[model samples]
Target chain A: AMSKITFKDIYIDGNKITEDSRKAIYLLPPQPLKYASNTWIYKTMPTMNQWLKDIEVQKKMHLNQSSYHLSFSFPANEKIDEVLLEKIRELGFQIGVLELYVIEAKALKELSRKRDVDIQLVSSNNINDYLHVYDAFARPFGDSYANMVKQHIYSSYNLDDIERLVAYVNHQPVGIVDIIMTDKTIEIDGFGVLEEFQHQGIGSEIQAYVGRMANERPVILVADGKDTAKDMYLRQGYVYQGFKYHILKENI
Target chain B: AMSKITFKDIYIDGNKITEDSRKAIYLLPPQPLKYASNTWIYKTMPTMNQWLKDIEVQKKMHLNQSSYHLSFSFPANEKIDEVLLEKIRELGFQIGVLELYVIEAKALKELSRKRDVDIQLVSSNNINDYLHVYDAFARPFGDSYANMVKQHIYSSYNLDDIERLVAYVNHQPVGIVDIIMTDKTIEIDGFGVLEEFQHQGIGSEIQAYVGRMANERPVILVADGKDTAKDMYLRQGYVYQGFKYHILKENI
Candidate 1:
């Protein structure tokens, strides 16, 4: 129930998220991390033509980065106009929907951490152990994106209660998890496994580990609505609350 | 001499250039205007390996861009390492050398503006007239780039003494010159003659018109060191002061 950029979730050091109104919010990922910043619009979605005009107005008012991005987020049970969806696709944006899930400690599967896998908490002494695995886990996102996210990690953990979990197999780092703790939840903000080593239950093991560590609090995360991982999380007892679409694109 | 981003020139609102000592300066072009933010290093360049490590250090310190950019600037007499140059090429950066030039009023050619070409200042009332033409002229750079630049123009002109000159040939805008004034000179920060209509003396006429308007203050601009335009600028009596190399790339 929080954006990845929120202070409680990630601090996002020099970045900013400004609300133009209750209808929209702008994510400014600092000038240094211009990789994934965007604007998200929700509630009372405007007509297609009107929204396009608003893009131009936002152009003059407050928008950042070389790429122009504006997303329409719809909660569960709310229907979006089919014509608007068609027009959006015509404009070239992803229809990637993300759904938030909250898993209670009792409901989480009691999958034991695999015997070959060992997870360690990232600390100042073994930082590169985490970064090394993250780089490989993030390799498909390209060096720049992985580098930017890694750099943000370096900056974010230096002054907060944030934590990172590195999963290793026979002492070789292969998986990663970014965790943030608030009064009510253990939030798994980022979770990924290296392609070469995925589908071995590494991801499920990490979720079970996080749930166990949650200490009776809820564990929350987001899964791609289009991914099989969503159903897997549900099978692991994650409650499907609602969903929102993430529409985005970039130009250099 | 000032960089185009300097306050004395274009002032890059919401941007910053922080000096990590006199050896380097980091350009932070706000999140909204990130098309050109970079780091510039000058004065006693470092060895190749040392500089690359320093880039890693800056990544942890003050760097603020998605693309990795660092330029080595040499002021005419500085010697560079050929081996380092080879390594940088291996790393895949451009060898774009740029030279600054200054043209005094007395040295400017006495060419007359062609009767068919009329140049006008960009005023708030006719701002779109300038943008419509600028978009056409900036077309080759792609719509996102042109749109980003056009958006910058709108924000820039609204608050500064900066000026833009649009040249119309038979009332169709075909050229542009972005101007900035300081006590010592009239700076032409950006200049272009639309390619479809190039080599027709419109560029020369704009030069002549600017000289006429300079009122004895020197006019200054930068020329691409590898371009024929450098030769053209030299033929117009512009003095070649010095050169600096720009090496950069991005992974967005």
Candidate 2:
């Protein structure tokens, strides 16, 4: 049941609504990632032109959203072979997946390796200590975007229970992850290492720190099924809950 | 009269509305510059706490615009002395200005120095030729932001009458400007040379090219009242017009 947790349960930047019998999430603030910012039908599907019309509506309504985005997630638990993937070409969309993974805290602790990096919990009381952690999370985006994330999204979380962790290497901010507390599960989110800091054992060390903090809760998270990060999650003792296949397109 | 034109007449990205006895522009998409993206009470006065409430409403409405932008534009033609400008510090806002300038085409052409670089008009017909020019404009900003500008703003204008001009130095895109044709005068908007291409006389040649392209119409433009570019415009045969003083605030 912990594995069932997905993006559907998380705090999105914008509103979600039903359009043409399909669940679509949109009107999100601008960012690099298209997956979280556009319209999509999940656990169901729509005809080609129908979703196209919805995308056109969104394009007109949100001047901030740059691309014309559409997503079609096939029914859950349905097997998709290469033949079905070819339909992506026929339908003219890129292929992607949303997969949930989970690990029991006590079990993760048993498999945890030694941590080479120190993990610090962020708090409002000590902003100077955690500014580097927030900076690490916003490493790729510009300063204004980082400020927006800090002021709007991160500010809303309860300081003590909802954890913001930064992994430091000898006082330098190297990587970061956000832990969201939900009913019956502690979800790991926004986990990443800076490009300059990758290929070291730092990522594993950070994972071990989370495992140490889990404290008997089943830790869960969603990952890109097509991404190599999913492989890392499985190797770190996480079980495959399931996946949502998505087909998306951008107008030329 | 020719210099009477202001940002009020141009096409803005979002809608404008009246709030608390002052006109405000808002709902603009996210970008690096906060000036164009936030609310401002222009050409009218307001009580401090009154506009603060309006900014709070906008902050709730537009998630894309990161900053809580509130601009208080003093009435046009009112000179802001240093003593009164101190009142800006007292009011807890930043000091700025919006100034409009005009130059007769024949007069400007007479004062124009010899041109060293060629200017090309960007047209939908010759996209391949102007792709580099567009690329030059998009150099500082990322590709997606460029695409949004191309689709939403530039696409609405008719190609020849409202022109997009890019300056080339031996086939390299160094500078660009947008010429908007009104009933009588030609408005020069979005004028700038690339940082690497600046201080090398390219900017003057670009201005000269616009003078040549003016075709007997008077050229008009808005400049930052406090910018050194005002002196540059005066040296380039432009006459001083009036200015609108603006005081803006952001939450600490």
Candidate 3:
């Protein structure tokens, strides 16, 4: 009799077999991604008046009485904004702890191609994709906290867990999103669009879809001093959460 | 009035300022390379018997009486040694941390010849020849502890500290002995001989010379598993002080 080896059935080991091997045979569920809370740069705490005003406009127009999802990522190169914080205070988000990575799209697409894999620009609200969610979240590190988060973002490709999203273009994996998920609210994490794809509507679509998912929940995001992406978010319904900072770590 | 642009006179606004452009402005010292302590990985404590035995050998050989320095790079991926912990305990070396990048000499030398740089076998003690230390020890998310250690090492390099019997060969500086004046003792560090130069009499001579430099004051060094260099110290009459470990931020 010959032995047949299925790709997925190959158990990892050498010749030795024992109780430990039996114990290892059970299929385990993937662990949930826990967002990193301490990653925010905390010096720029107040100074975003115009951004908050923009948020107020959204609150009156879009999120008036409906459930809205709110999300945002940490600002690049911290500069404080007061109005943003005031709006966050009004919406009652206490600035929970979160860390984010800004992943670009081209890098994600290349990675998927190299690995012969498929990554989707799907939002978490599509509860129908749960099994593929398990499939999508897995990578070299199996069922780990890191891999779960990687599944959420389009390009992040599994670094650390934080509030983030995934990006895709024309059904192909284009990038990833950074975000936080709770029962009622979702925070838009720092996101990266492919360098070539900027100015197109993909970034806004991802943001708006996640915001709709927030449904009755508040969505939030952070932008930078020179980052023109703020206008796009303002054009959508995201209100500023008013917090800023320059992160510095001493080598001493 | 004629506008004078070239004759070194300048006017701003309407104020009669003392146009202070001098023949030449004196120079200021260049800022030293500085960063933060990055990442570290710590191994668990060694067993008591192994620790005691190594310490006993060190004491019996009179190594504990004089300060010693040791360096190991390109770990063949082994466990931490018991003797290292012993040395740290005896020497009270609290902040002894940094990762060693032991790249293959053949590969590097090949590149050197191609790149037209004088290549040579150097010692770990002479790691300052290149700024690769920062790369070796940087954390995935910017660690401060490792950076501080690297910057201090770079800043401590200068003319006054050259006579410490460190060997720098070819145009490539390979190794050097880093001896510092600490509060309790004159510490010895950076005791590295290039990988290719190992098993040669050069390391023996350097160790013996450093032992002599101890001049009755105790010297210390951290050793790792599989490091027979400790044997050289034993032959030179240095004792094992006991073991210590680096509480690092990463898994070595």
Candidate 4:
């Protein structure tokens, strides 16, 4: 059994519900990965037509020709084969996996740096700063289509629920780490090092930045298990909580 | 037999010679991976003492106490074992593989983008931009020991041999990519994105930038096979040239 964390509610019945959608439809923001940008996660498998319909709805709600992204998550019991993968691909989605991990605030480690790295909390009103943060966050996927997904889908979430921070060394923007705050835990999302600055200590610095801001709240974030950064998260003391598979539909 | 490209002279009798050695000892700069920083490439197995001696010489020639990085490349005919790996580790060396890939200037594709990503050729006189590039490149290997290697090793290269470029979106410095030009080829080295700006297509933009600047010269670079970006290189029309094994020694 996976170790339980407070964000488990978001994974109720194996469907990730990322926001408090009580009064209205609130979608989770776009992460660099698939599922977070994906508005609905299904605990059980849905038919291909249903999947297509969901993407259509998301397209109507959240995208323009400049860009678009739609993802669907299926539970463990769900069955998918190459044919389904082909279908998803035909819909303009890429294939990817999303894994969730968590670490208690006590488990976090303190890291020292020789260079001064300043992490600034982004204010909602600062569009200039926001643009920098957004560009830094979006520049990696630079596909106009994917960028559109992030621009539309990721930009729609409630700003109050997320704390955006950009890392700087000597006053230059090097990375971005955003946290979604909940009562019991802080889910760190969109933690990225600009392509040029990756594999350097900036990731650890950003991790340290978020660990400090976590303020006793456990830190949670999802990883694409297909990538090496998962091992990085493990090194940061984040334990594997759970994982889910999401089919992405995107046109290359 | 492997498909040969124009840059094959770089593999001089198994020693990776990436730059012009005219009148001076010019070592390739340190990349996040191997080969790029390793000054000596051994075509045959060397005794453990020889390994230690090479490191000592590199340290004396290139580094200070804060860091040191020396990699020894071995040919296929060279014999190695776990014991050798253990021996290298005992001497503060880490083992890794460096895989080289290349693409012709004409084979490179022009990638389109939604965002205006500006690539600037950083003049050696511009220390501020240099620092940003260095920090982004060095911040990934932040272990105090590896940090020292970058601090000492990356700082030693002749800036005249290298051309540094920074990527910006909306006037914010988001990433850095540097290249070493040989008479026959432009070996792209130290390509990095600020931690926050990775995966957003800035890498391709930087690559395109280098391709345009190469002026019909072939482009070459190495990647750790343990990484995924190698495929991205393939998508960019780069073909695998060959690979070399190296022992990396770092203080941290």
Candidate 5:
């Protein structure tokens, strides 16, 4: 199975596995949207029929959100049967495209920034500064998603594996991004700009700040291909690397 | 003036700056080697008479150590007057040499290690693990030097700039090192192995561990030219970058 972050699992029958498990299960009772977690299997038999069968299982499970992130390796040329697509649509499932991009270390120095934003590292003493920016990011997703985002932020911060940074303008947080660093590269994730703060060059400034912190390591990030944000990334010196698609079934 | 880390100072006349200043001055009353701080006027009028003038000033100060770092750039061809050398020796001062070395990011992978040891980051919660290793490092230095070392360690930890790491063998702390990280390079400092643990490959293992943590940035460090440790660094894929010289007059 493809490796990714794992979490404790909660079964609908009121059983809770406290140990971290890789299985795609939801939170237990008491946890809001206990059924809305990402339960999609990343790697499965490469056939639409297999996906349909999985969806049937999900339907029976009565999950809050029927979200399945199809792997990048999913055959790009294969066509899903109309009958299966209709069945998926019946569950309110829609296709979402994601594009991944990478910028070379040298290119980072060449990028230009226009915004006068102050970017600073978030230390343990003032982690609340970053949490406020995370809240701004969750604003777009509404209430339940906001809670889930907060839960993830708190867990990641406690793990002490990722670096959190907040960008401020006039001492007020305008944007934020979490950096996942490895030996060779930094992956920018959970990046967001508040709606009122958008189109003010905050995004470019944040990217520039990340490029400087990356310290000659390549910077990588994924953008929602369905959105025009990819164009902004392209303008900011990132080159389109590739694409991945996920199928989501939102509650009607 | 070239930029480097600095500390606050207190005057011999019972005046304290209170504010941290970037000037390279020695410690004052109640601090040993109070005159030995980076006060060696790195680039002064290169003459013996000028040195005499500085020593006279230091003598009036009644510092624990009237020390100054002479530049490595003192013409290799120029000779120090024997009379000046005698004058310096009469004051119980001695000449000390230091060599700086740097290793490429890729050269780090060529390092070999045979010891089964664990090197881990020292978080604030487990900082005592590192302080134990610090104690081991302080073993060679006498009581006064040990106190000075402790003072530096405590100050650095509170600064929140340097990362402290400890190496353990068989669950016993064997060595310690502090890493000062920048955007382009990792400078390894305060590296030490306990006397009982020497020749056990712990030092090499710790250096190798730093090279790995460095990712792809160059690792830089300085060694006392008077010591044989430079040979070990040479074998560990480090190249002699350059040298600097210093003069010391310890309290009799």
Candidate 6:
């Protein structure tokens, strides 16, 4: 026999929703990969430390950790200066959390490979490439998203735009972390591990290393939504701050 | 009174959409522009020409005119190989177009002595400076872009990343253009003319001259959603086949 568990509905980023819709959109306790909403900053960063602190100073000028570990961005625009970046690293010395979103699946998978996940890394050098991924994934899910991915999600980053980052995996690329600089703080964009790689501590090890790097400055990371990884972050002492969500359905 | 105009849409890359909700999104017609996409073919003159012709023979690549512009990625990768670039200039043949997205903005605008639209150029040594234009025009409509402007979009044959086309407008440090080289062709990646100095046909002259400098190979350019310089490009016989729209909406 199997047992089922149900829980109350919670809103992440959505403002207005009925109880029925909330019921349909089941909510779970905040997890490790929970996205910090309303407070999310979208920018690009070269280094992890710099990416971390920008978010720390957002919403309210709070401060936390210093230094950095991983770095990332959605469509990195290498415009921010190193001096400002270093200042962000300094800011991370006070606040210790920052997060970025929707890094191309390929890059995330590639980072995961340092942990050894079977998934392939998608590239975002060109938005079309992401559409390719969307197309490939669409077959499994459906093609309704193909155009939206091509026009909207794909357009989020320039097709010619390319961003690079360094990842270290103790074993396979299963559990890896990405950091980047957005408009505000240094951010952890993609952090995940395969089911097989979980419980082995690979994710934490990499995050701990990255956290240590950003420890010198007040780095800030967001944990929202129902992702399981947010639990790992909380276990490692990441504080709950805010929430963020993205609704794609046409009907409200 | 303003009349409400609901919209319908079409699809060119329908095969790429994946999600059902996303499929509900309609794609607008590609805007009219003289922008061209180009690819850098890093080869000697005769060989590069052969390569360009070979690409033409394959399928009449869509973005040959707008998609293949080589400015940001290729030039900075290697040092100037002027001999090879000169040969390309001599051979002068291409199926695509050429354009420069300078890493420095304001300086380039100053060099061009025009403040058109879509972007405001500023000067910064940061290679990532080009992102001001990249990120600013990333929105769907014409606004809500990153205000920080810094980047130079230029190209000179075989200049790798930074070519030496350092010409200035009125000596107020307007802007410069660099020719970058790739594996197959030379690119003009670093080109900038300041904002206040635009509109006086400097861009047209620059394109025409750059076209001449390209020596018969394809020249390409990308314009922001609101940039009107494409009219000048049309005068030079540039055409548009596709678009690369950027979307930056707050997550719901």
DockQ by candidate, in order: 0.01, 0.01, 0.01, 0.02, 0.01, 0.01
Off by over 4 Å in 5: A1-252, B1-38, B59-83, B112-115, B138-141, B225-228
lDDT leaderboard ranking = 1, 2, 4, 5, 3, 6
lDDT of each: 0.60, 0.59, 0.35, 0.56, 0.55, 0.32
B46-82, model 6: which lDDT tens digit per residue?
Answer: 2445434533532233233222211111121122233
Provide the lDDT at A145 for model 4: 46
lDDT of 2 by residue, A1-252 (tens): 564555555444344544444565555544423446555544555445555575566556544555555555654434344344544566576765566667887766765353567777776544444555556666457877677666654455553355777777777777777787766677887777664454345667777777777776788887753332443454456765555566676662
Clashes of 5: 1
At residue B203, give the lDDT of candidate 6.
57
Docking verdict class for candidate 5? incorrect
Alpha-carbon runs more than 4 Å astray in model 2: A1-13, A17-21, A29-35, A63-68, A71-75, A79-92, A113-116, A125-162, A194-201, A225-228, B1-252
Model 6 chain A: lowest-lDDT 10 consecutive positions: A1-10
Interface RMSD of each: 26.4, 27.6, 29.9, 13.3, 28.3, 22.9
Residue runs of model 4 more than 4 Å from their true location after superposition: A6-38, A47-70, A76-93, A112-115, A124-130, A133-159, A195-200, A225-231, B1-252
Q: After superposition, how far is residue B124 of candidate 4 from its true place, in Å?
A: 57
**Model 1 over residues B158-199: C-alpha lDDT tens digits?**
676778888887777788777877676787856777644554
The model with the greatest DockQ is 4
Task: Give the Å shift of residue B86 in candidate 1.
Answer: 3.5
| Candidate 2 or 1, higher TM-score | 1
- Give lDDT: candidate 2, residue B26: 55
lDDT score, residue A170, model 5? 84
Q: For residues A164-234, write the lDDT of model 5, one tens digit per residue.
A: 78888888887778787766677877677765565446787788778777777778776552342443454
Query: TM-score for model 3?
Result: 0.23
